[PDB]
Symmetry: D2
Subunit: 367 residues, 4 copies
């Protein structure tokens, strides 16, 4: 496939569709690095396998994997899930994957953002990320899709959410941080989102809930369920580490309008009652430069980190008293979809969840 | 997708390997680099594979698979219409470690994943290990969402046989009956594997090939099918040629052979280079114990027979020999309605083979 | 360093000393491969760390480790243990390491045997083993030691034991097996041992206790405690998978004399009462070509697989009722040494134990 | 071995000795990466082999090499040269190697600076450099030597020169560039050099000659031949790419005194008459993020990039008319040493020379 040079998605008539628009397939990277994942990734591999299986009932599923894990990965996953060899540094394809864009006429392209492991050498989560940064192009090659590379602009798919109708929702905590694009003004960043997502309105939330991990990705806080409709985390437990950020996001969203002038309909999503924490007993390597996983570390367990995929919604389950409530709430957001909970506490120990380990590929429409 | 198909054979399941002259959906190639085979860290041969890939792409969608380290360079070198995948490998001979695709009459396609052992394993193979090469067939099948048969404990390479798509396979005794392949099997057991996995009824045995030390005499340097009932065979009257005895004998055998449908084979002569191609001397190639040495004066297996038939084109070796044009003329007469493209591939021949051995076709589904 | 070509240790005046002779250093490879070791090697890395620590009290200790695990390995091990990067396929340096030989005139060389993962493509335990087979040379380079490469002769250090005085002890089950040197007669194999160890008498035991794993390495069955003195595993439990082999080894040893004509003194060593087994809950990858680790598999848990190292002896502990008895018995074999038990059941799940995961380097 | 934490070389009584002080051994990395080195590194491997061979006549020599190249490397090098497997991203051990320091009492330690491929993500020469950055510690482990790690302080051995007597010589162009330690002032950087080298006086030259490559490493411009004596490149060819910087370095050195108050004696060293250039016909991969090697690129061919090693001095030879003159001049700087020229144009295509591909290890004294 080819790089598209000298033009933007917007100029070329391509847009990032909403995650709730029809999907051709879904992508995932197989997890393994022992300085993030306990027990050499054996527990988290089971969780990713379960997520992959859940998605595959709704949408063709694909997993990419290192040279060393290829044979095990192919054995673990059912044959209807396609497996590719692909080098990688960690397994977060929401964030190092391509963001696909489509036009009105049956074509699809990829946006290949610069990836830097959530803050690079300022506050990134490991070093290096050179193989992660090639995942977007390799997936586009597989798909025979041409791509835009955003030179000198760092972004992750998990840091924004689109409605497919001219709006993007994001967080100041993430995009304005020192480790991302520190030379750019907020206005310059807005222009990049407009140009590459094909949007005209940027909705800024303030804080996210994981300042140390992704620097507050919006996908743990709020998302679009449909045009003009958002879900937002909510809690009234003032002891929650998520309390202030959930409260502020909720209040901001109530009065936001999208690009079409619709006042957002905000649907509350609960949070886990109890903190999910790293235990010192977890067998995780310490490596200088890799984010430590220390006893008592509070993990970012948000139910918002779900994947919408065709007729299904794949929702985190953390072993919390609110697991059932979360499924009930998401069901009401998507009354005509099948809601599937998957036990993903093993994913959350590594810094994210179902949404951060997947990347959808939309169906081409038109032509 | 890829499941393995277990407890049955292609023949039992109504699949057959089509002739290489039947319509193709795609062609595959591995990007070359290993410095104990390829001089100058593969730079000269990478240019040659690029030219071969470009030539194929004019006729048939083209695909190259490449190591982690060479991915970025490979993608830069190849035009964008050629798709590039990361794929681990030990060397770049996808005719031999690739899958052999088979089709049925209902529009389906499956892969045959043979056991690969680097042309003789620890008996007389060309390097060690070959564990990544041996996974290429499954990985390409995965990319294609194609289910595959794995031939447990049976070693074979795609370059070691040729099929007419109509019940016949052509092969060499020098290769398939050698100690480093399947020494526990009788000739009859080996015939059965060919019949079951290719869907053939008649195995035509040539004797010697022309590269006993390299592939143990792959048929694809000696003779191939141009169409059902029609073969091409190398030919020389130079008794000083290292190819002479094997060329003369293959030719004589073929003139006495009938295919599975009882047709007397029509044999078309293909010339050989007048001058030997040799390793120099001055080539910068690493020596590693266990890897086939490339020593000054080594005669390289330069056969014009190692061409690829691909849809409306035929891609033919050119060695810088006086017979390069004659070879193109002869191939044109074999395929009067195809476009014949010569590509300078002497840099590939230094590494032990040529255009046919660095490619693997994927047939179109029919029925389908 | 240089390869020594056209001669053998015996011709050049070098011999492999007994393991009970003084040692300069000990070597170990860091374990990790997930199709042998459960939980991506985390539990076994703790056991190897504990073994390395125990050895370091007696003898300078060295661990070699893959690119990916180097940083973790260096963090886990105390600083007195030296850490080198070294590619490898699995972590059994007794078997893919060099066997060092000395001339008792200040010089030392290595024997670099051909390694094939305990049976190659016939019955080996994984494929490939190309990096394992380079370990012996790389360790010799580190030590500035010249080496003899035994072209077309496959051997592992764990398959034989020497007294340093002209005798070697081995098993027919291992050395005569199809996956090792099937082209060679028993007598030709004897001659290779004589040439490369500098011995004159080969003592052949019959069966080992792990036919499927190493093909019956002697180092799980019997060893030399001192010149003229051996220890042999023993059990009276006819339900033991070790029963017949232990019984025959013991009976053979009672009838053997060494190269100096000494009747061997034969001490019995207990065996674990209960079988150690792979559990179904163990999280181990399956890969075609790699020895499967399946529920109920009996693991080769022998107390014989101990390392003699200067003033210490490092002895397996399996969590078995006989763990303390084993330490008692080894103490009586080496009355002037410190006997240290280490919990090594995690190592045994992967097919061997303390002796297999170490390689000594003798003092010059 | 151990990391030394909570103290510096200076506090602990360790100093970096001059390169002209006795050496136990020398280190080198084996080159191969095809997006720097033409022909998959075959020509440059021959050059590194020749450099290693020359050094070995004076001082025991050691080469470290990738998994893939180990067997070829061991075959190419004579057996007296010890070969170790060691992962790396490129082959510039002067710069990613440890800088050894010694005390007066028979001990040696290593300083392990942060390495970032000569400017990191600002203007570094490739990405990533994670394996390069582990070379210093792995070499220290081989040697059983304890090391100081300079957290958050980036430095390369080729960016400074010491006299072993309290002075360090360096360049503003390199140490003060954005891609190195931009949060640190000049004064903060001086303090790090003083603490880690055990020096009291930092002599700042201005420009180096390779702003795009190493950002002007001092070891292409000037070095110490002995306490109180320096060599400095010199040319009167105004068309020379090295003219302005050679002229300015020379003038600054003429005004400089060392940490012991000695007026520096400055010895001129010629520069090549003709520019060494990359040819478009060189077969070198282009990779976004790796310094391109384009037709007509002027290579940094300095005769200053020589290695002093015990009784020998190993001097670049570029195939230039001034090759002999360079040997004559270095001979007069070291009248009692054996001067050995080695053809190293294949090294210079990749951005440096003999000094940048070696790292000495001093003899323990006392």
């Amino acid at each position: 496939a080819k790089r598209i040079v000298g033009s933007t998605p917007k100029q070329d008539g391509f847009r990032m569709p909403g995650e709730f628009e029809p999907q051709e397939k879904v992508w995932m990277i197989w997890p393994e690095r022992p300085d993030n994942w306990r027990d050499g990734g054996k527990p988290v591999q089971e969780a990713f396998t379960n997520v992959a299986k859940a998605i595959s009932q709704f949408t063709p599923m694909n997993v990419v994997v290192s040279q060393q894990q290829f044979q095990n990965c192919r054995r673990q996953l059912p044959p209807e899930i396609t497996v590719y060899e692909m080098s990688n540094n960690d397994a977060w394809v929401r964030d190092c994957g391509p963001s696909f864009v489509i036009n009105d006429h049956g074509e699809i392209r990829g946006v290949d953002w610069t990836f830097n492991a959530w803050g690079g050498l300022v506050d990134g989560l490991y070093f290096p990320w050179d193989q992660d940064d090639l995942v977007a192009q390799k997936i586009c090659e597989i798909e025979h899709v041409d791509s835009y590379r955003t030179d000198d602009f760092v972004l992750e798919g998990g840091s924004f959410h689109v409605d497919g109708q001219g709006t993007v929702l994001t967080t100041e905590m993430c995009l304005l941080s020192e480790g991302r694009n520190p030379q750019l003004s907020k206005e310059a960043i807005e222009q990049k989102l407009c140009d590459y997502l094909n949007v005209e309105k940027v909705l800024w939330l303030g804080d996210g809930i994981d300042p140390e991990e992704t620097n507050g990705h919006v996908d743990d806080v709020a998302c679009f369920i449909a045009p003009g409709e958002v879900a937002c985390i909510y809690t009234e437990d003032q002891n929650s580490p998520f309390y202030e950020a959930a409260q502020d996001a909720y209040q901001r969203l109530l009065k936001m309008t999208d690009a079409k002038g619709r006042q957002l309909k905000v649907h509350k999503l609960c949070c886990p009652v109890k903190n999910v924490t790293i235990k010192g007993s977890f067998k995780i390597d310490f490596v200088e430069g890799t984010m430590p996983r220390e006893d008592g570390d509070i993990c970012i367990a948000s139910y918002m980190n779900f994947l919408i995929t065709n007729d299904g919604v794949i929702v985190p389950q953390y072993g919390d008293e609110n697991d059932r409530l979360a499924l009930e709430q998401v069901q009401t957001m998507f009354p005509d979809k099948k809601i599937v909970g998957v036990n993903t506490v093993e994913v959350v120990y590594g810094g994210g969840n179902i949404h951060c380990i997947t990347q959808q590929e939309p169906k081409r429409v038109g032509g």
